[PDB]
mmCIF file of C-alpha atoms and ligand atoms in Angstrom:
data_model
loop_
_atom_site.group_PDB
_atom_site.id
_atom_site.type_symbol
_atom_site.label_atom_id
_atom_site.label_comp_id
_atom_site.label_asym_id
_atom_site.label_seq_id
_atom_site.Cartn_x
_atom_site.Cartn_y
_atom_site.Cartn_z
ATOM 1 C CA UNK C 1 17.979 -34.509 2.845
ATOM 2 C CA UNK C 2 20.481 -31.611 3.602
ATOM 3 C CA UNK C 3 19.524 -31.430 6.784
ATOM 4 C CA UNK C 4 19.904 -34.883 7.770
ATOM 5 C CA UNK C 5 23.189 -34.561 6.016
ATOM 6 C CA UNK C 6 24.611 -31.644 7.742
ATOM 7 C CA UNK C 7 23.724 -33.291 10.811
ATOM 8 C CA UNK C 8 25.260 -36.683 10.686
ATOM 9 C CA UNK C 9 28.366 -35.130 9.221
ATOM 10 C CA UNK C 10 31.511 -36.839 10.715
ATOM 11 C CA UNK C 11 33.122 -35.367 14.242
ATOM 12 C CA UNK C 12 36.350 -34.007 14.440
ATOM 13 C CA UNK C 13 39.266 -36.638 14.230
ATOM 14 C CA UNK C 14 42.930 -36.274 15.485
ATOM 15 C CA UNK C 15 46.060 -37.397 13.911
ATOM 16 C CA UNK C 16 47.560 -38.090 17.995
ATOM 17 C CA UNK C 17 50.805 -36.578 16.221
ATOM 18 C CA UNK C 18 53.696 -36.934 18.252
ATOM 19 C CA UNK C 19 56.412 -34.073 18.086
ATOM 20 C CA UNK C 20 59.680 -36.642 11.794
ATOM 21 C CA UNK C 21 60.663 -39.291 9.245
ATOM 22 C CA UNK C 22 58.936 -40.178 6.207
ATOM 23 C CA UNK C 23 58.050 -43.201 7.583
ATOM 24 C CA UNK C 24 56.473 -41.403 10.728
ATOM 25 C CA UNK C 25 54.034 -39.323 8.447
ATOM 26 C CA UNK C 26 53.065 -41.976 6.358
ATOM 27 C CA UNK C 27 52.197 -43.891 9.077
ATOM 28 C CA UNK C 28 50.633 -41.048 11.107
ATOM 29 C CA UNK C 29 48.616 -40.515 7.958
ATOM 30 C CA UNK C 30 47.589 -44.370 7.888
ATOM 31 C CA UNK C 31 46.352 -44.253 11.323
ATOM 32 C CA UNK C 32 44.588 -41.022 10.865
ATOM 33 C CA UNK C 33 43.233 -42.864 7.636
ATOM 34 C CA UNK C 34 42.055 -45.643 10.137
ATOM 35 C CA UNK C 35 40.572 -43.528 12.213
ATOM 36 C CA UNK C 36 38.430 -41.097 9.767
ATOM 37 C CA UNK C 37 37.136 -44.463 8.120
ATOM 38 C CA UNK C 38 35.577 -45.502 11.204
ATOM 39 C CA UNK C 39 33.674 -42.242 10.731
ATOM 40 C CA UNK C 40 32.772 -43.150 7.479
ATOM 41 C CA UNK C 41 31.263 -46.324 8.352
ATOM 42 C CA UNK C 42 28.953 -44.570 11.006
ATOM 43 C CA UNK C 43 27.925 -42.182 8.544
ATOM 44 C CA UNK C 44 27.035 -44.617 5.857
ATOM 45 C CA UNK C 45 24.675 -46.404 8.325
ATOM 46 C CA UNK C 46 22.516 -43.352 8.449
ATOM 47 C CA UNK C 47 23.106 -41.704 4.904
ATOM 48 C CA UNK C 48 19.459 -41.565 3.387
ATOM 49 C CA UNK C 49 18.957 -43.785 0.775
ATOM 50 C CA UNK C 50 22.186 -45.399 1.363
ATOM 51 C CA UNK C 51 21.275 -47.843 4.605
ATOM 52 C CA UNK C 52 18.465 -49.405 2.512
ATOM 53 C CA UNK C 53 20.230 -51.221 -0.606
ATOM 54 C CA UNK C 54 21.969 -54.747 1.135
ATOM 55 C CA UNK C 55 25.056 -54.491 3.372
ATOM 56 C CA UNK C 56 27.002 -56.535 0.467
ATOM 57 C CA UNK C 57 26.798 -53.475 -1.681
ATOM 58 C CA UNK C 58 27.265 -51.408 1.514
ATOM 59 C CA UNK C 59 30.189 -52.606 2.424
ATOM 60 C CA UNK C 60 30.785 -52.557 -1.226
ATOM 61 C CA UNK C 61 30.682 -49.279 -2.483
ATOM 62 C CA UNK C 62 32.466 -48.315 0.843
ATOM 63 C CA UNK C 63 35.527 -50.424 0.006
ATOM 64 C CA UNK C 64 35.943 -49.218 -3.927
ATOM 65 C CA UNK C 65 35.547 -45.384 -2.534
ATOM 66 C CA UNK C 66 37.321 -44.901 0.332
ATOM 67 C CA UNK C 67 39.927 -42.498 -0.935
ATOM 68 C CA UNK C 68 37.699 -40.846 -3.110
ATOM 69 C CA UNK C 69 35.797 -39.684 0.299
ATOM 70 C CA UNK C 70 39.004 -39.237 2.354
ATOM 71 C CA UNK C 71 40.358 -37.063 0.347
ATOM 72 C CA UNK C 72 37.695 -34.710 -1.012
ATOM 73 C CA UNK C 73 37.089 -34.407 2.551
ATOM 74 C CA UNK C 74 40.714 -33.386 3.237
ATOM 75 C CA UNK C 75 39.686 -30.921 0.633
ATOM 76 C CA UNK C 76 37.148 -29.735 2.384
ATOM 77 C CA UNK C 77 38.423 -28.958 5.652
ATOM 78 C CA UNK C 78 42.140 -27.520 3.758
ATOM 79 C CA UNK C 79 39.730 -25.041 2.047
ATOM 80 C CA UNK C 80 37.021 -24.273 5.199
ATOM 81 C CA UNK C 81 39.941 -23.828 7.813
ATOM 82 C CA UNK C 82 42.911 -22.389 6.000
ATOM 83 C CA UNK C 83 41.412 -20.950 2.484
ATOM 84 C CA UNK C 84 42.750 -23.414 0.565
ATOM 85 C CA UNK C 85 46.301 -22.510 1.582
ATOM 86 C CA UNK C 86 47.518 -25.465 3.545
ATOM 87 C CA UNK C 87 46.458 -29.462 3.548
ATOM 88 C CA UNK C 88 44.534 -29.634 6.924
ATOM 89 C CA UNK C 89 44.613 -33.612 7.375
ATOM 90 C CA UNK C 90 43.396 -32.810 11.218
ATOM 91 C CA UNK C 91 43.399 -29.705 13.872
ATOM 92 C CA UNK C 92 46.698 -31.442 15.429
ATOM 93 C CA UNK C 93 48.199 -32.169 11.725
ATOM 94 C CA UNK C 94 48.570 -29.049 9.111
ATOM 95 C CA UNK C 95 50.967 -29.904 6.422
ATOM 96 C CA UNK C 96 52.781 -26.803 4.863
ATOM 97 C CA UNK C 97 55.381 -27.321 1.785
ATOM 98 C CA UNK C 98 57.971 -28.637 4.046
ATOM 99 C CA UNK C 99 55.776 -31.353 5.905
ATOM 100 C CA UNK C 100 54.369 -32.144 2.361
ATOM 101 C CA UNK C 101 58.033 -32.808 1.165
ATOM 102 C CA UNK C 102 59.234 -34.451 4.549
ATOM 103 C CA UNK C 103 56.183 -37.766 3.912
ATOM 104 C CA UNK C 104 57.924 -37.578 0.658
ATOM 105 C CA UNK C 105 54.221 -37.222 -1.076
ATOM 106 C CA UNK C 106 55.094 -33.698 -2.647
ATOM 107 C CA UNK C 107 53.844 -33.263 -6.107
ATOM 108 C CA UNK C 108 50.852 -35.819 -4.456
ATOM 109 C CA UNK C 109 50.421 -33.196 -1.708
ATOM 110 C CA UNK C 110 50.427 -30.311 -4.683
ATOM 111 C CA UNK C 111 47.546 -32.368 -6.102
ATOM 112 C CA UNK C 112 45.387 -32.410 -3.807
ATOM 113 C CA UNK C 113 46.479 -29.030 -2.522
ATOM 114 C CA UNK C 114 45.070 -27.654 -6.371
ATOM 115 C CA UNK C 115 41.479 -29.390 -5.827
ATOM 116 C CA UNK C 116 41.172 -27.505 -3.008
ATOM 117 C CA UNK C 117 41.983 -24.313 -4.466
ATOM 118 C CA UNK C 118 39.128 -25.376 -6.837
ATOM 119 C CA UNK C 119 36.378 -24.928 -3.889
ATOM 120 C CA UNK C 120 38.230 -21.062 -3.318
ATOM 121 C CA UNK C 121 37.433 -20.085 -6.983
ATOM 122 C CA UNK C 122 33.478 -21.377 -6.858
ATOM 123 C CA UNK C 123 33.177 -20.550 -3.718
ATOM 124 C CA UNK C 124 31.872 -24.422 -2.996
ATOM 125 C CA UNK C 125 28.430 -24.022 -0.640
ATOM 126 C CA UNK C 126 29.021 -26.999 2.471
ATOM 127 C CA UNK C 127 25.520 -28.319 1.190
ATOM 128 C CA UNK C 128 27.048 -28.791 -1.881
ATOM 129 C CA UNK C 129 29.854 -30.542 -0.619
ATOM 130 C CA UNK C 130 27.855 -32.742 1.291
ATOM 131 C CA UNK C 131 25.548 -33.938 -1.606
ATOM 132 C CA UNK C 132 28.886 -34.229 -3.680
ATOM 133 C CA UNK C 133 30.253 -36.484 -0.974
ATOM 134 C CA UNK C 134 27.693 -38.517 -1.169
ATOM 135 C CA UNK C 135 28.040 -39.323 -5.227
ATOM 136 C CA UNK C 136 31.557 -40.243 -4.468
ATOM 137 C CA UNK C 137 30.064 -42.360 -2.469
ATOM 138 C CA UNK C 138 28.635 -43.432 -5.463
ATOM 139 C CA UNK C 139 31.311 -43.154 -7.714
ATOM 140 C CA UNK C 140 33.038 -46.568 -8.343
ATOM 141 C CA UNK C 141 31.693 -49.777 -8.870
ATOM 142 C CA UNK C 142 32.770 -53.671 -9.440
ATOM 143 C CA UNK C 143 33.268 -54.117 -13.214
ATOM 144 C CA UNK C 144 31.299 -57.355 -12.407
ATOM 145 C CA UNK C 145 28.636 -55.447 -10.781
ATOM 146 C CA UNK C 146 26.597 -54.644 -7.321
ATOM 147 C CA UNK C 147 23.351 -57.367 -5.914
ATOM 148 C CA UNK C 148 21.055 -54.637 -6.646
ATOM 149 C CA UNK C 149 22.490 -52.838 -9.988
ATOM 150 C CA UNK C 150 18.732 -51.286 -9.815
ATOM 151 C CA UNK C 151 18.269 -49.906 -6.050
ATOM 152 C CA UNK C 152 22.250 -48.656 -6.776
ATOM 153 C CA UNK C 153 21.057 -46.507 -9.709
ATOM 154 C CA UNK C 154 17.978 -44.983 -8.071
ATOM 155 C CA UNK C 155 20.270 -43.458 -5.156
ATOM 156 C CA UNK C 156 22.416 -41.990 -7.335
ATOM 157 C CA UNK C 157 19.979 -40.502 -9.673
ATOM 158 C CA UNK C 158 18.346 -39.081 -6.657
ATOM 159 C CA UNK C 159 21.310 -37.479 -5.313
ATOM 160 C CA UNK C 160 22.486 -36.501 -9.102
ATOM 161 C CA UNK C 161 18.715 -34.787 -9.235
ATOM 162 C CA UNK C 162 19.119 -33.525 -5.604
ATOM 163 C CA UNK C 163 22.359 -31.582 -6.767
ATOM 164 C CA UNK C 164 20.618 -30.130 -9.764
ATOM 165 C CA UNK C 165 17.968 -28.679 -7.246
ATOM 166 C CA UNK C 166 20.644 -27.923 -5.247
ATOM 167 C CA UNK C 167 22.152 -25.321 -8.215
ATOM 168 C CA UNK C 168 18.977 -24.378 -9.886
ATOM 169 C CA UNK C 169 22.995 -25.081 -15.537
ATOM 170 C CA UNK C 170 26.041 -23.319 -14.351
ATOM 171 C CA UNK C 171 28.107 -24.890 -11.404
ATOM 172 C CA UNK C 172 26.320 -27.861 -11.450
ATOM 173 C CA UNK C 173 28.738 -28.638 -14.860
ATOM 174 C CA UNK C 174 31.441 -27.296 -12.436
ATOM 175 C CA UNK C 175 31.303 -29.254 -9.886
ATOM 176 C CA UNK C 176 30.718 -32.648 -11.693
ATOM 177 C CA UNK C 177 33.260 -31.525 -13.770
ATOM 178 C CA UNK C 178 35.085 -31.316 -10.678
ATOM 179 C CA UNK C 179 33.765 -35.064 -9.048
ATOM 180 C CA UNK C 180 35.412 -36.255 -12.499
ATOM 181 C CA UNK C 181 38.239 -34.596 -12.108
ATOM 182 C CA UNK C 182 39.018 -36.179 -8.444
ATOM 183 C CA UNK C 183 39.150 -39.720 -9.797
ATOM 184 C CA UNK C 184 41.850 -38.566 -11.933
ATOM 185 C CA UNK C 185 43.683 -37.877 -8.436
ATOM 186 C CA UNK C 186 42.733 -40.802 -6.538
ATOM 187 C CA UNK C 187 44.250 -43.337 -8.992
ATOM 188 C CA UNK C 188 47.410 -41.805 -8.316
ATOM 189 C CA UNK C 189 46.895 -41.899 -5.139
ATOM 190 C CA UNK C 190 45.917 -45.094 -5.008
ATOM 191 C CA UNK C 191 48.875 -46.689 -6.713
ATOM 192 C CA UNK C 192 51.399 -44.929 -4.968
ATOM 193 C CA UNK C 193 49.293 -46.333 -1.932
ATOM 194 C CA UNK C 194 49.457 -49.925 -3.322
ATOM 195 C CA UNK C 195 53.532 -49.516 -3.621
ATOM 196 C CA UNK C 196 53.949 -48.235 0.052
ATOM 197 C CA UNK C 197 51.791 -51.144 1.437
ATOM 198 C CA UNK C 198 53.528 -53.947 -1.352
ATOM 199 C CA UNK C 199 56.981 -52.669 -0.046
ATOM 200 C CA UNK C 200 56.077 -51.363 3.733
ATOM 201 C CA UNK C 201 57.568 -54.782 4.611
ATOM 202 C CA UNK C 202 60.856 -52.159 4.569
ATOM 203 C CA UNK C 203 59.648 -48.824 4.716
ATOM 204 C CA UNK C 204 58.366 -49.674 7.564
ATOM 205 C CA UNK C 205 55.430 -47.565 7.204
ATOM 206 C CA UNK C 206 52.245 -48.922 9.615
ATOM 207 C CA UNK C 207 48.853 -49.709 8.082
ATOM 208 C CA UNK C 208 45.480 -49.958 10.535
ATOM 209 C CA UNK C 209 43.390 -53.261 10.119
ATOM 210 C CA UNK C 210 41.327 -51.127 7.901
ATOM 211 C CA UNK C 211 43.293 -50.053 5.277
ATOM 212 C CA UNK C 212 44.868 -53.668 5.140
ATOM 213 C CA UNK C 213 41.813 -55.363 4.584
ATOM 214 C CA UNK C 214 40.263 -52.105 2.095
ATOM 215 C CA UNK C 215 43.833 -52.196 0.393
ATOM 216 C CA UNK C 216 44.350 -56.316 0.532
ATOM 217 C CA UNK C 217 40.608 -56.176 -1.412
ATOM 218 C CA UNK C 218 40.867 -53.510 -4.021
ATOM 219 C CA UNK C 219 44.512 -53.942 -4.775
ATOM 220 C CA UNK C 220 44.431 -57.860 -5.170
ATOM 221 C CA UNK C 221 41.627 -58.521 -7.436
ATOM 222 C CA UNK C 222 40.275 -55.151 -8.352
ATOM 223 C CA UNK C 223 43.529 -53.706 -9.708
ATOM 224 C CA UNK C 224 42.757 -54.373 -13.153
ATOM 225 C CA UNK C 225 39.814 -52.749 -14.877
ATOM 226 C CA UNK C 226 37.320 -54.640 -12.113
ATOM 227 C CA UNK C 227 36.091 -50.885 -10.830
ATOM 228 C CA UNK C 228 34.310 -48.674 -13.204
ATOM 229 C CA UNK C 229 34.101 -45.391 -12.948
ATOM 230 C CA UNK C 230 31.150 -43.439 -13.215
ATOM 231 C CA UNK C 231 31.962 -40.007 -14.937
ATOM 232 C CA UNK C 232 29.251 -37.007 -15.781
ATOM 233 C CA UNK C 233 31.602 -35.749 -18.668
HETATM 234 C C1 SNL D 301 47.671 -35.603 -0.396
HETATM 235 C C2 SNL D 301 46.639 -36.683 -0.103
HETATM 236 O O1 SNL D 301 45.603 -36.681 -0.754
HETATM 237 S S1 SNL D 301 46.890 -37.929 1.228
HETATM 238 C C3 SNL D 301 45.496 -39.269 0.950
HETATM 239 C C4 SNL D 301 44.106 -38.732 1.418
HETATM 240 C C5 SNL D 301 43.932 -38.637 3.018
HETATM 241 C C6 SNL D 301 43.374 -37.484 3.570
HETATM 242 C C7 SNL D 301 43.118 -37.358 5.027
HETATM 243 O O2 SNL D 301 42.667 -36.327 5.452
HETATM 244 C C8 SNL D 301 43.459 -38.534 6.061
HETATM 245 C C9 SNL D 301 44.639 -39.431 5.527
HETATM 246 C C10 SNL D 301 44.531 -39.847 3.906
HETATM 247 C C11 SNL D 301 43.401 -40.979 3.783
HETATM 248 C C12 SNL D 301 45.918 -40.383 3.323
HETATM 249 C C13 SNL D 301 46.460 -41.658 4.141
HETATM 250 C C14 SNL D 301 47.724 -42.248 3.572
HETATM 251 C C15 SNL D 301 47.600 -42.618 1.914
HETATM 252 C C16 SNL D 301 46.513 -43.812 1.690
HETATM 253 C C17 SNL D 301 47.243 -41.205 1.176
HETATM 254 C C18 SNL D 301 47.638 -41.386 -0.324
HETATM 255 C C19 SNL D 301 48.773 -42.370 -0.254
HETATM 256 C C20 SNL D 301 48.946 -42.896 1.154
HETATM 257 C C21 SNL D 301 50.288 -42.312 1.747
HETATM 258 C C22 SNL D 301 51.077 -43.516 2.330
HETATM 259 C C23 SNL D 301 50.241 -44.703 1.958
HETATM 260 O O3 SNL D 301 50.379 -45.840 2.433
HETATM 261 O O4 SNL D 301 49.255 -44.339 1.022
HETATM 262 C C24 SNL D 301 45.909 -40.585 1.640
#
């Protein structure tokens, strides 16, 4: 289980940044979006547990938590490679308070910026992280609901059980506490993602095939209260 997951962790990915409008971060960040999401795909294939419930639900809980995993990761690598002091989107693309204020995404970038200071203060393990990844993965689901509402609450009970063997009652309130915490985050990311894409017709900010189809799909129908989230608190 945590071996497998160490292992098929993601590779390194590269924003390509090009040395500065808003526009060109934004877009930059889009791309780079793009690009990490292939990893995600790759690594859903092979997550344990995961590959075995129907690709509907696959693709599925892929397309309702996509920022949820995008940006705990960002967390991640802000907090492995600079302490926690700096939003480290990719090796080639370190945001400090001025780049967070040029993609006009400041108090956004400060939000972020404080989940990441989270993992400095308990010190998160990277097998935790990885197991925590994976119940975002797990984290939002059609109000409606998935093909197999039953093989869907087995993986996530495992995980959920896997974490608790992971701790052993101390972090393990912490860090959900924490999972719960990030949903709070992506919503507001999320909307302010929905405006740039419903209005990138003049801000002229770019959007990979990906995130068109991801946003075109969860911002549509799904905008309303068609994703439930799945809180431990
Ligand atoms: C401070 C943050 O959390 S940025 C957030 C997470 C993230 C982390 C990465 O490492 C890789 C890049 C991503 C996926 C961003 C890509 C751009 C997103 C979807 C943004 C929130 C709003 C925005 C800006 C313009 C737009 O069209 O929507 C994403």
């Amino acid at each position: 289980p945590v071996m497998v997951l160490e292992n098929i962790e993601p590779e390194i990915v590269y924003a390509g940044y090009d040395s500065d409008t808003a526009e060109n971060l934004l877009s930059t960040l889009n791309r780079l979006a793009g690009k990490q999401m292939i990893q995600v795909v790759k690594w859903a294939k092979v997550l344990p547990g995961f590959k075995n419930l129907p690709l509907e639900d696959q693709i599925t809980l892929i397309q309702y938590s996509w920022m949820c995993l995008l940006s705990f990761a960002l967390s991640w690598r802000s907090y492995k490679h600079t302490n926690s002091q700096f939003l480290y989107f990719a090796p080639d693309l370190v945001f400090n308070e001025e780049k967070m204020h040029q993609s006009a995404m400041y108090e956004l970038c400060q939000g972020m910026h404080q989940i990441s200071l989270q993992f400095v203060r308990l010190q998160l393990t990277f097998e935790e992280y990885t197991i925590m990844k994976v119940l975002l993965l797990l984290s939002t689901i059609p109000k409606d609901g998935l093909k197999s509402q039953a093989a869907f609450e087995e993986m996530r009970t495992n995980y959920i059980k896997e974490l608790r063997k992971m701790v052993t009652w101390q972090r393990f309130y912490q860090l959900t506490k924490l999972l719960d915490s990030m949903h709070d985050l992506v919503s507001d990311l999320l909307e302010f993602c929905f405006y740039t894409f419903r209005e990138s017709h003049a801000l002229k900010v770019e959007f990979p095939a990906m995130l068109v189809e991801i946003i075109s799909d969860q911002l549509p129908k799904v905008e309303s209260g068609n994703a439930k989230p799945l809180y431990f608190h």
